[PDB]
Each structure stands twice: as structure tokens, then as C-alpha cells.
Short mmCIF file of all heavy atoms in Angstrom, two decimals:
data_model
loop_
_atom_site.label_atom_id
_atom_site.label_comp_id
_atom_site.label_asym_id
_atom_site.label_seq_id
_atom_site.Cartn_x
_atom_site.Cartn_y
_atom_site.Cartn_z
N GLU A 1 -31.94 7.84 4.09
CA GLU A 1 -30.60 7.61 3.61
C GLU A 1 -29.67 7.39 4.78
O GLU A 1 -29.81 8.00 5.84
CB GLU A 1 -30.14 8.79 2.75
CG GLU A 1 -30.72 8.80 1.33
CD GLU A 1 -32.12 9.38 1.24
OE1 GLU A 1 -32.64 9.84 2.28
OE2 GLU A 1 -32.70 9.39 0.13
N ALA A 2 -28.73 6.47 4.60
CA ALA A 2 -27.73 6.21 5.62
C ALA A 2 -26.50 5.74 4.89
O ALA A 2 -26.63 5.04 3.88
CB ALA A 2 -28.20 5.16 6.62
N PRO A 3 -25.30 6.13 5.33
CA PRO A 3 -24.08 5.78 4.61
C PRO A 3 -23.82 4.29 4.62
O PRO A 3 -24.32 3.54 5.45
CB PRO A 3 -23.00 6.54 5.37
CG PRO A 3 -23.72 7.64 6.02
CD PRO A 3 -25.03 7.08 6.41
N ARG A 4 -23.04 3.88 3.64
CA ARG A 4 -22.82 2.48 3.34
C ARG A 4 -22.02 1.84 4.46
O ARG A 4 -21.10 2.43 5.02
CB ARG A 4 -22.09 2.36 2.02
CG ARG A 4 -21.99 0.96 1.59
CD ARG A 4 -21.06 0.76 0.46
NE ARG A 4 -21.02 -0.65 0.22
CZ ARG A 4 -20.24 -1.50 0.89
NH1 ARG A 4 -19.43 -1.05 1.84
NH2 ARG A 4 -20.29 -2.78 0.60
N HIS A 5 -22.36 0.61 4.82
CA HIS A 5 -21.60 -0.15 5.78
C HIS A 5 -20.30 -0.59 5.13
O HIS A 5 -20.31 -1.22 4.08
CB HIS A 5 -22.39 -1.35 6.26
CG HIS A 5 -23.55 -0.98 7.11
ND1 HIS A 5 -23.41 -0.63 8.43
CD2 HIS A 5 -24.87 -0.87 6.82
CE1 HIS A 5 -24.60 -0.33 8.93
NE2 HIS A 5 -25.50 -0.47 7.97
N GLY A 6 -19.18 -0.22 5.74
CA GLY A 6 -17.89 -0.73 5.35
C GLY A 6 -17.35 -0.06 4.09
O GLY A 6 -18.08 0.34 3.19
N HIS A 7 -16.03 0.05 4.03
CA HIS A 7 -15.38 0.69 2.90
C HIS A 7 -15.39 -0.23 1.70
O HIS A 7 -15.10 -1.42 1.84
CB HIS A 7 -13.95 1.07 3.22
CG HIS A 7 -13.33 1.91 2.17
ND1 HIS A 7 -11.98 1.97 1.95
CD2 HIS A 7 -13.89 2.77 1.29
CE1 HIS A 7 -11.73 2.81 0.97
NE2 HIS A 7 -12.87 3.32 0.56
N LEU A 8 -15.69 0.31 0.54
CA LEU A 8 -15.60 -0.49 -0.67
C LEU A 8 -14.19 -0.62 -1.19
O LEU A 8 -13.97 -1.45 -2.08
CB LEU A 8 -16.47 0.09 -1.77
CG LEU A 8 -17.93 -0.26 -1.58
CD1 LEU A 8 -18.77 0.50 -2.56
CD2 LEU A 8 -18.07 -1.74 -1.82
N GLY A 9 -13.24 0.16 -0.69
CA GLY A 9 -11.93 0.18 -1.32
C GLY A 9 -11.15 -1.09 -1.08
O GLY A 9 -10.30 -1.47 -1.88
N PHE A 10 -11.44 -1.78 0.01
CA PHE A 10 -10.61 -2.90 0.41
C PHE A 10 -11.27 -4.22 0.03
O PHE A 10 -11.67 -5.03 0.85
CB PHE A 10 -10.32 -2.82 1.89
CG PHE A 10 -9.64 -1.58 2.26
CD1 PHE A 10 -10.25 -0.66 3.07
CD2 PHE A 10 -8.36 -1.34 1.83
CE1 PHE A 10 -9.59 0.48 3.44
CE2 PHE A 10 -7.71 -0.20 2.18
CZ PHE A 10 -8.33 0.71 2.98
N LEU A 11 -11.38 -4.42 -1.27
CA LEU A 11 -11.92 -5.65 -1.80
C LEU A 11 -10.95 -6.20 -2.81
O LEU A 11 -10.21 -5.44 -3.44
CB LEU A 11 -13.30 -5.46 -2.44
CG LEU A 11 -14.41 -5.66 -1.43
CD1 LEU A 11 -14.67 -4.42 -0.63
CD2 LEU A 11 -15.64 -6.12 -2.14
N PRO A 12 -10.90 -7.52 -2.99
CA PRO A 12 -11.58 -8.60 -2.30
C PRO A 12 -10.99 -8.86 -0.95
O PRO A 12 -9.81 -9.06 -0.79
CB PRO A 12 -11.35 -9.79 -3.22
CG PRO A 12 -10.17 -9.45 -3.98
CD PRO A 12 -10.18 -8.00 -4.17
N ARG A 13 -11.86 -8.82 0.05
CA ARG A 13 -11.41 -9.02 1.42
C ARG A 13 -11.15 -10.50 1.62
O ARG A 13 -12.03 -11.27 2.00
CB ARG A 13 -12.45 -8.49 2.39
CG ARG A 13 -12.01 -8.45 3.80
CD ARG A 13 -13.07 -7.79 4.59
NE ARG A 13 -13.21 -6.42 4.14
CZ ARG A 13 -14.26 -5.66 4.44
NH1 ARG A 13 -15.24 -6.14 5.17
NH2 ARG A 13 -14.32 -4.42 3.98
N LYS A 14 -9.92 -10.89 1.32
CA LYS A 14 -9.49 -12.27 1.26
C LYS A 14 -8.19 -12.44 2.03
O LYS A 14 -7.57 -11.47 2.47
CB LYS A 14 -9.29 -12.69 -0.18
CG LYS A 14 -8.12 -12.03 -0.78
CD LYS A 14 -7.92 -12.50 -2.17
CE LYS A 14 -7.50 -13.93 -2.14
NZ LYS A 14 -6.24 -14.05 -1.37
N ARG A 15 -7.78 -13.69 2.19
CA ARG A 15 -6.55 -13.97 2.91
C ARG A 15 -5.34 -13.50 2.11
O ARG A 15 -5.27 -13.68 0.90
CB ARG A 15 -6.41 -15.45 3.21
CG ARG A 15 -7.39 -15.92 4.26
CD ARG A 15 -6.84 -17.10 5.04
NE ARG A 15 -6.70 -18.31 4.26
CZ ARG A 15 -7.65 -19.23 4.20
NH1 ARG A 15 -8.77 -19.04 4.87
NH2 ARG A 15 -7.49 -20.32 3.47
N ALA A 16 -4.40 -12.88 2.82
CA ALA A 16 -3.27 -12.24 2.18
C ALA A 16 -2.32 -13.29 1.67
O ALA A 16 -2.31 -14.42 2.15
CB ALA A 16 -2.57 -11.30 3.15
N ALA A 17 -1.51 -12.93 0.70
CA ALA A 17 -0.78 -13.93 -0.05
C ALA A 17 0.48 -14.41 0.65
O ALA A 17 1.05 -15.42 0.22
CB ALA A 17 -0.41 -13.37 -1.42
N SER A 18 0.94 -13.74 1.69
CA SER A 18 2.14 -14.15 2.40
C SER A 18 2.02 -13.65 3.82
O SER A 18 1.02 -13.04 4.18
CB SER A 18 3.40 -13.59 1.74
OG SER A 18 3.53 -14.07 0.42
N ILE A 19 3.03 -13.91 4.63
CA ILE A 19 3.02 -13.28 5.94
C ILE A 19 3.79 -11.98 5.87
O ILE A 19 4.00 -11.32 6.89
CB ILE A 19 3.58 -14.20 7.04
CG1 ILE A 19 4.90 -14.84 6.62
CG2 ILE A 19 2.57 -15.22 7.43
CD1 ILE A 19 6.16 -14.13 7.09
N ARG A 20 4.26 -11.62 4.69
CA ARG A 20 5.09 -10.44 4.58
C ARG A 20 4.50 -9.60 3.45
O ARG A 20 4.52 -10.01 2.29
CB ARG A 20 6.53 -10.80 4.31
CG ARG A 20 7.43 -9.62 4.27
CD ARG A 20 8.82 -10.06 3.98
NE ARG A 20 8.94 -10.64 2.65
CZ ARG A 20 9.15 -9.93 1.56
NH1 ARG A 20 9.27 -8.62 1.64
NH2 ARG A 20 9.26 -10.52 0.38
N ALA A 21 3.96 -8.44 3.81
CA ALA A 21 3.28 -7.62 2.83
C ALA A 21 4.29 -6.98 1.90
O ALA A 21 5.33 -6.48 2.35
CB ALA A 21 2.46 -6.55 3.53
N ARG A 22 4.00 -7.01 0.61
CA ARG A 22 4.92 -6.46 -0.36
C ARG A 22 4.78 -4.94 -0.35
O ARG A 22 3.67 -4.41 -0.20
CB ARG A 22 4.68 -7.04 -1.75
CG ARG A 22 3.37 -6.70 -2.41
CD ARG A 22 2.39 -7.84 -2.38
NE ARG A 22 1.19 -7.49 -3.14
CZ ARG A 22 1.03 -7.69 -4.44
NH1 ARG A 22 2.02 -8.22 -5.15
NH2 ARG A 22 -0.09 -7.34 -5.05
N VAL A 23 5.91 -4.25 -0.44
CA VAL A 23 5.88 -2.80 -0.45
C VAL A 23 5.44 -2.31 -1.81
O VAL A 23 6.05 -2.62 -2.83
CB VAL A 23 7.27 -2.26 -0.10
CG1 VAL A 23 7.31 -0.78 -0.31
CG2 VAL A 23 7.58 -2.59 1.32
N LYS A 24 4.38 -1.52 -1.82
CA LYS A 24 3.78 -1.10 -3.08
C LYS A 24 4.50 0.06 -3.73
O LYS A 24 4.73 0.02 -4.95
CB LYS A 24 2.32 -0.69 -2.86
CG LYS A 24 1.29 -1.75 -3.18
CD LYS A 24 1.41 -2.97 -2.31
CE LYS A 24 0.34 -3.97 -2.65
NZ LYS A 24 -1.03 -3.46 -2.37
N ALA A 25 4.85 1.10 -2.98
CA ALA A 25 5.36 2.30 -3.61
C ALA A 25 6.54 2.84 -2.83
O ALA A 25 6.45 3.11 -1.64
CB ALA A 25 4.29 3.38 -3.70
N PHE A 26 7.63 3.02 -3.53
CA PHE A 26 8.79 3.61 -2.88
C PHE A 26 8.75 5.11 -3.11
O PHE A 26 8.08 5.56 -4.05
CB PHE A 26 10.05 2.99 -3.46
CG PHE A 26 10.21 1.57 -3.09
CD1 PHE A 26 9.77 0.57 -3.92
CD2 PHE A 26 10.76 1.23 -1.88
CE1 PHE A 26 9.92 -0.74 -3.58
CE2 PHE A 26 10.91 -0.08 -1.53
CZ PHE A 26 10.48 -1.07 -2.37
N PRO A 27 9.41 5.91 -2.28
CA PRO A 27 9.41 7.36 -2.51
C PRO A 27 10.17 7.72 -3.77
O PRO A 27 10.93 6.93 -4.32
CB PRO A 27 10.11 7.91 -1.27
CG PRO A 27 9.92 6.87 -0.25
CD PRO A 27 9.96 5.58 -0.97
N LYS A 28 9.96 8.96 -4.22
CA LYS A 28 10.58 9.45 -5.45
C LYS A 28 12.08 9.60 -5.32
O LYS A 28 12.64 9.52 -4.23
CB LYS A 28 9.99 10.79 -5.86
CG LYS A 28 8.66 10.68 -6.52
CD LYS A 28 8.10 12.06 -6.75
CE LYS A 28 8.90 12.82 -7.78
NZ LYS A 28 8.30 14.16 -8.07
N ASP A 29 12.74 9.85 -6.44
CA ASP A 29 14.18 9.75 -6.43
C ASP A 29 14.81 11.05 -6.87
O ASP A 29 15.01 11.28 -8.06
CB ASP A 29 14.63 8.61 -7.33
CG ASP A 29 16.04 8.19 -7.05
OD1 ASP A 29 16.66 8.73 -6.11
OD2 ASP A 29 16.55 7.31 -7.78
N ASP A 30 15.14 11.91 -5.91
CA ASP A 30 15.93 13.08 -6.22
C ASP A 30 17.36 12.65 -6.49
O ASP A 30 18.03 12.08 -5.62
CB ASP A 30 15.88 14.09 -5.08
CG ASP A 30 16.51 15.43 -5.42
OD1 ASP A 30 17.04 15.62 -6.54
OD2 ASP A 30 16.48 16.32 -4.55
N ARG A 31 17.85 12.94 -7.69
CA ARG A 31 19.20 12.53 -8.02
C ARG A 31 20.20 13.63 -7.76
O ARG A 31 21.01 13.96 -8.63
CB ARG A 31 19.27 12.09 -9.47
CG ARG A 31 18.41 10.90 -9.68
CD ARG A 31 18.62 10.28 -11.02
NE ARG A 31 17.69 9.18 -11.20
CZ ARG A 31 17.91 7.95 -10.74
NH1 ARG A 31 19.01 7.67 -10.07
NH2 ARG A 31 17.01 7.00 -10.94
N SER A 32 20.14 14.20 -6.57
CA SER A 32 21.09 15.22 -6.17
C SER A 32 21.56 14.89 -4.77
O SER A 32 22.63 15.31 -4.34
CB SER A 32 20.44 16.59 -6.22
OG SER A 32 19.38 16.64 -5.30
N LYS A 33 20.75 14.12 -4.07
CA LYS A 33 20.96 13.90 -2.67
C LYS A 33 22.03 12.85 -2.45
O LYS A 33 22.39 12.12 -3.37
CB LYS A 33 19.64 13.47 -2.03
CG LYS A 33 18.62 14.57 -2.03
CD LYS A 33 17.35 14.11 -1.37
CE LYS A 33 16.30 15.20 -1.44
NZ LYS A 33 16.70 16.36 -0.60
N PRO A 34 22.57 12.76 -1.24
CA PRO A 34 23.40 11.61 -0.90
C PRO A 34 22.58 10.34 -0.85
O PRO A 34 21.35 10.36 -0.78
CB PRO A 34 23.94 11.97 0.48
CG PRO A 34 23.96 13.42 0.49
CD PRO A 34 22.75 13.85 -0.27
N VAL A 35 23.29 9.21 -0.85
CA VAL A 35 22.64 7.93 -1.00
C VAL A 35 21.93 7.55 0.27
O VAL A 35 22.48 7.61 1.37
CB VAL A 35 23.67 6.87 -1.41
CG1 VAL A 35 23.05 5.51 -1.43
CG2 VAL A 35 24.19 7.21 -2.77
N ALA A 36 20.66 7.18 0.13
CA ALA A 36 19.79 6.98 1.27
C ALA A 36 19.07 5.65 1.12
O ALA A 36 18.58 5.33 0.04
CB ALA A 36 18.79 8.12 1.39
N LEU A 37 19.04 4.89 2.20
CA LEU A 37 18.25 3.67 2.24
C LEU A 37 16.81 4.01 2.58
O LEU A 37 16.52 4.61 3.61
CB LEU A 37 18.85 2.74 3.27
CG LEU A 37 18.37 1.31 3.33
CD1 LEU A 37 18.78 0.69 2.05
CD2 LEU A 37 19.07 0.64 4.46
N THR A 38 15.89 3.60 1.73
CA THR A 38 14.55 4.16 1.78
C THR A 38 13.60 3.44 2.72
O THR A 38 12.57 4.01 3.07
CB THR A 38 13.92 4.16 0.39
OG1 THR A 38 13.84 2.82 -0.09
CG2 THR A 38 14.79 4.95 -0.52
N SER A 39 13.92 2.23 3.15
CA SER A 39 12.99 1.55 4.03
C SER A 39 13.75 0.55 4.86
O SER A 39 14.97 0.44 4.74
CB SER A 39 11.90 0.82 3.26
OG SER A 39 12.45 -0.28 2.60
#
């Protein structure tokens, strides 16, 4: 037995759709805090 070559999570390993990666997940929103720019 030997572990698998390469991670399976990053499929389809293809050319990305833009030169600017889209942000997937923004942080959660505490509605008590002062206004904050998140990224």
C-alpha cells in the first residue's frame, strides 16, 4: 500500500476562468459591530 499521488480535491484541474479569482466566502456578519470593510 502507498498513498495516492496528488490530491483529489482539486479537480477538474483546468485553466481558470479569469485572471482574477472570485472570492468564494465572506466572513460572517455580527450585526453589533462598527462597519468594517471585509476584504
Side-chain angles (χ1 to χ4, degrees):
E1 283 82 3
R4 187 192 177 277
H5 291 282
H7 189 205
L8 281 171
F10 301 115
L11 270 84
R13 189 174 297 165
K14 70 178 291 301
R15 290 209 292 267
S18 298
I19 47 96
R20 183 181 65 85
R22 66 256 185 88
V23 171
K24 262 63 179 296
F26 292 95
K28 282 173 68 177
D29 197 4
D30 189 359
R31 297 190 184 277
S32 63
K33 293 181 182 293
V35 174
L37 191 64
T38 61
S39 70

